[PDB]
């Protein structure tokens, strides 16, 4: 009775469901101020396998939103979806009012800077590693980005300055320097949206404070979603979402969630100690 199925049509429908492609005639995202909306977003990667369930939130332009909660794939799935690394199973994600699945992924990604937990360094010069943020940038901009991220002086001390080979087959950068490369990349991109996934490791007190300050500074005036581990990041966020098992179980600013006296407050009391 499936003698009437058109195999070509099944393959066309498979392709729609399973591949992240631009719609025919998709135009550029019209980026204004970087308002983000998730509306009733679900993400499931098979039958029963739901990693985000009915997730809704709004991040107003320039604001920061911290994602917190126990270990789980939900928090970083939210970052992936905003980047359209996957399509959503249902609901809608919008930037500046526009459904991000209806625009070119290229245009979408041009406005988003990702700062991952682990900084990818290529087997290339330190100049070109920073330049990776925006390949078109002149040497002077690369320098100013390095200067602003606080690694210019270190690079000067490098055996070949900006032409110093780094990465796996190059000079070993410290964890601080590596992180600052990520920041300089982001400065060079100048995106309107930042997706930050905080590292679980930490550096010395002095460096941590300095890096946390640089990060705070590059996120200034930019719409920011962060998968947060540091208390300072959460205390300072415009809004906090507590995610457990793919659900937003509570939300608000730090002080409001403490006085609410739920899951977040319990976590805070546990971290404080007797």
DSSP 8-state symbol, 30? -
Indicate the burial class of 43 (C-beta count within 10 angstroms; 0-12, 13-18, 19 or more). Answer: buried
Q: Is 170 annotated as a binding residue?
A: no
Q: Is 56 annotated as a binding residue?
A: no
Asked whether residue 216 is assigned to any structural domain, the reply reads yes
Asked whether residue 203 is assigned to any structural domain, the reply reads yes
Q: Is 138 annotated as a binding residue?
A: no
DSSP 8-state symbol, 102? G
Asked whether residue 49 is assigned to any structural domain, the reply reads yes
Strand, coil or helix: 68 = strand
Asked whether residue 16 is assigned to any structural domain, the reply reads no
Q: Is 78 annotated as a binding residue?
A: yes
Structure tokens at 172: 């070993």
Residues 6 or more apart whose CB falls under 8 angstroms from that of 102 comprise 23, 26
Asked whether residue 169 is assigned to any structural domain, the reply reads yes
Domain of residue 211: give its range: 33-268
Structure tokens at 151: 């690694």
Q: Is 72 annotated as a binding residue?
A: yes
Q: Is 75 annotated as a binding residue?
A: yes
Place of tokens 């469901």: 17
For the chain, how many helices (H) and strands (E)?
11, 12
Number of domains comprising the chain: 1
Asked whether residue 5 is assigned to any structural domain, the reply reads no
Distance CA 190, CA 28 (A): 18
Asked whether residue 184 is assigned to any structural domain, the reply reads yes
Distance CA 46, CA 34 (A): 31
Structure tokens at 76: 């970083």
Asked whether residue 150 is assigned to any structural domain, the reply reads yes
Instruction: Report in angstroms the alpha-carbon separations of 170 from 151, 163, 176.
Output: 17, 11, 17
Residues 6 or more apart whose CB falls under 8 angstroms from that of 87 comprise 20, 101
**Of 149, 110, 111, 112, residue with least CA distance to 129:** 149
Q: Is 145 annotated as a binding residue?
A: no
Instruction: Read off the CATH number of the domain in which 193 is found.
Output: 3.40.50.300
């Amino acid at each position: 009775s499936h003698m009437f199925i058109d195999m070509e049509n099944m393959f066309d429908l498979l392709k729609e469901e399973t591949e992240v492609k631009d719609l025919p005639g998709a135009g550029p995202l019209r980026f204004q101020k970087g308002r983000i909306e998730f509306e009733n977003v679900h993400f499931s990667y098979a039958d029963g396998r739901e990693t985000l369930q009915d997730v809704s939130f709004t991040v107003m332009p320039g604001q920061t939103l911290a994602l917190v909660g126990p270990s789980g794939a939900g928090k970083s799935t939210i970052l992936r979806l905003l980047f359209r690394f996957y399509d959503i199973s249902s609901g809608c994600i919008r930037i500046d009012g526009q459904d991000i699945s209806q625009v070119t992924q290229a245009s979408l990604r041009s406005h988003i800077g990702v700062v991952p937990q682990d900084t990818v360094l290529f087997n290339d010069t330190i100049a070109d590693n920073i330049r990776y943020g925006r390949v078109t940038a002149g040497n002077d901009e690369v320098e100013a980005a390095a200067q602003a991220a606080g690694i210019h002086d270190a690079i000067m001390a490098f055996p070949e300055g900006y032409r110093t080979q780094v990465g796996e087959r190059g000079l070993k950068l410290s964890g601080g320097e590596k992180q600052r490369v990520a920041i300089a990349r982001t400065i060079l991109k100048a995106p309107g949206i930042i997706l930050l996934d905080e590292a679980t490791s930490a550096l010395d007190t002095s460096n941590e404070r300095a890096i946390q300050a640089s990060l705070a500074k590059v996120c200034a005036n930019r719409t920011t979603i962060v998968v947060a581990h540091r208390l300072s990041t959460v205390v300072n966020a415009d809004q906090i979402l507590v995610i457990k098992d793919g659900c937003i179980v509570e939300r608000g600013r730090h002080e409001a969630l403490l006085s609410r006296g739920g899951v977040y407050a319990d976590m805070w009391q546990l971290q404080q100690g007797q």
